[PDB]
Amino acid sequence: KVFGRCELAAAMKRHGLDNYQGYSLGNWVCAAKFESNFNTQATNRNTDGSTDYGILQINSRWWCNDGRTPGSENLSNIPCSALLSSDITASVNSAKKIVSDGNGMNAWVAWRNRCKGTDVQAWIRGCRL
Amino acid sequence: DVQFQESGPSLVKPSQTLSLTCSVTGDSITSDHWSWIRKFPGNRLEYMGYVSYSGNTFYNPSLKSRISITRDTSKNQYYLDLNSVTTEDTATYYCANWDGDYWGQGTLVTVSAAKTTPPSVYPLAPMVTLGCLVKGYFPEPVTVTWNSGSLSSGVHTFPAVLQSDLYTLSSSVTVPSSTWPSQTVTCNVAHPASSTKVDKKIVPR
Amino acid sequence: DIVLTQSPATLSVTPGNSVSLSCRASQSIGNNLHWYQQKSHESPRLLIKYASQSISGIPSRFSGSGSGTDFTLSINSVETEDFGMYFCQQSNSWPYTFGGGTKLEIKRADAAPTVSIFPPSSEQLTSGGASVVCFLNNFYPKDINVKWKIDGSERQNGVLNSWTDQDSKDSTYSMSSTLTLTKDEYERHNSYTCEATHKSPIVKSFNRNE
Ligand SMILES: [Cl-]
Ligand SMILES: [Cl-]
Ligand SMILES: [Cl-]
Ligand SMILES: [Cl-]
Ligand SMILES: [Cl-]
Ligand SMILES: [Cl-]
Ligand SMILES: [Cl-]
C-alpha cells in the first residue's frame, strides 16, 4: 500500500509515534517520505548484502530475518516480509525498538540528511489528523 | 524458548555494592534491549535501566548515578552494579527483555547489617493436617516443598515474620488419613544463603 | 517523568462479571501503554502491548483500549485464577514508569476455617524454645479473628499472624497463628486453646500432660 501524506500522518498518530522518544509526528512522516516514498512494500538492497524493508526501511542485519543477510545473528527475528504489510503495526513496533537503541532517529540516514532540524511540522500541515 | 535468569548475593550490607548477573538462554532469542526492573516490598515497580542491542546504556535518573549496566555478548550475559545501597534498595530484582515478553524469576535482595543464620526446621505432628516450623533464619528467602513437590495440592506456606534480625514461617500440608503415617510425609526446606537443605520426616509422637 | 495513576488500588469482583481497570497518564503517551498481571511467587506476565495489541498465550477475555492519557484493561468473565496485581507501564518516554497497581480480589460465599493446633516439637523444647502453632485453612472472607487461651485464660502477648494470598482455585484465604513462649512458661501450663472467630467460633486445644 502507498499512503497519502495526511493518511500516513493519521495512522502514525493512531500508532503512537507522535512524541515517541520526544520525536514529533512530522519527523516520522518526513522519514517515511525519504525512506520509502510512503510505500509499505519498498525494498532496497545494501552493498553489505542486507536489505531495508517497508515504510521505514528496517535493516535485515539487525532487526528482521530475510534468509540471505550475511552475519545476521538472530534467525527468530520477525520475518522481513512481515514489515511489508498494508497494516503498519509491525513496522511501527520495529521503528520504536530502533529509535530506543541509543542513536534516536539518527539510525535513519535519510531522516538525518533531509529531515533533522528542518520544519518537519510541514509534513503534517494541511492535515485533519 | 527464551529464558532470562538472575543470580548473585541475596544480602548486601548498607553502603556496599549490589551486583547481579543475567543469563539469556534459549533457541528463540531475538534482537532486543536487555533491562533491569525491581519490585519494592510494597508492590512498587521501578524500571532501573537497560543496555540496547547496540550496547548503549539507559539509566533511571532516580537511581542518582549509583547504577552501572555492562554486558558480555560472547556469554549472552549482562550485569547490574548498584553502589552505596540502603534499606530503600531491598527489593525483588528482575532481568527482562525490553519487549516485556520474557522476565526472570526474580531474586530477593536484602540490604542489612545482620548475619546469615541457617534455619531450625521442626516437625509439627498431631484428612490429617501436618506442618513444619522454619525458625531463626536470615535473610529471606527459604523454600518449603513436601515430598519433593509431589504434594503440591493441600500445601499453604505462610509469609515469614521478622523478629530480632531472624525470620520465622510455617508450612501446613493436608493428606488423606490413609496416606499417613502408613506412607512417609517429609518437609524439604532450602535456605540458599546459608547453603542448607533440610529434609524433616513427620513422625507421630 | 510520566506518572501513571491506577484508581482504585483495590477492586472486588464476582466471577463471570466484567471488570475495567483504569490507567491515567499525567501527559499524552499515544498507544505506548503495556499491561502486566503479577501473582506473588511469580514474574510479571505481559497481557497487552501498545494499549490494545494481543499477546500470544493470553486468554481472549483480556483486552485493552484507550490512547493519549486514558487507558483501560477489560476482563470479560473474570475467573478465579484472575486474582492478583495488574500494572500499567508506559514506554513513550525514558525513564519508563509503572502505575501503582490494582489488586483484584475474587468474591465468593462465607467459609469457616479447618483449624489445627500443634504443641512445641520435642526437638524445639530440647533447643530451649516453645512455639505453639495454629493453622486456619481455607476460609472466607479475609478478616478472621484468632484468640489464644492458656489454662482457660486469654493470652495476647507473643502471638504473630500471617495470611496467604487468595487461592487461585477456591478464592479462600489461609493463615498461621504462632504463640512463642519460653520453655519455662510452656512447662508451667497444661491447656492450650486456639479459637477462630468471624463476625460462633471454631476451637482446638491440647493438654501438655496428655
Ligand atoms: Cl508528499
Ligand atoms: Cl495502518
Ligand atoms: Cl520532567
Ligand atoms: Cl478466555
Ligand atoms: Cl526456638
Ligand atoms: Cl490477598
Ligand atoms: Cl513466630
Numbering used by the authors:
A (entry chain C): 1 to 129
B (entry chain H): 1 to 126, 135 to 213
C (entry chain L): 1 to 199, 203 to 213
From the study:
Here we address this question from biophysical, structural, and immunological perspectives using structurally related lysozyme proteins.
When structurally aligned, the overall FlexR101D and RigidR101D complexes superpose tightly (antigen-Fv components with rmsd of 0.49 Å over 258 Cα positions), with localized differences observed in the antibody–antigen interfaces. The swung-out flex conformation (the loop in question untethered by contacts with symmetry-related molecules) is further enabled and stabilized by altered conformations within the antibody component of the structure, whereby mutations at both framework and hypervariable positions result in CDRH1 adopting a different conformation that complements the altered antigen structure. Enabling this antibody conformational change is an ensemble of Hy10 mutations: L4F, Y33H, S56N, and Y58F. L4F and Y33H, which emerge early in the trajectory and often in combination, are connected in trans via a conserved framework residue, W34, which rearranges its large indole side chain to sterically accommodate the leucine-to-phenylalanine change at position 4. The Y33H mutation results in one hydrogen bond being lost but two hydrogen bonds being forged by its bidentate imidazole side chain: one with antigen (at position K97) and the other to the peptide backbone at antibody heavy chain position 53.
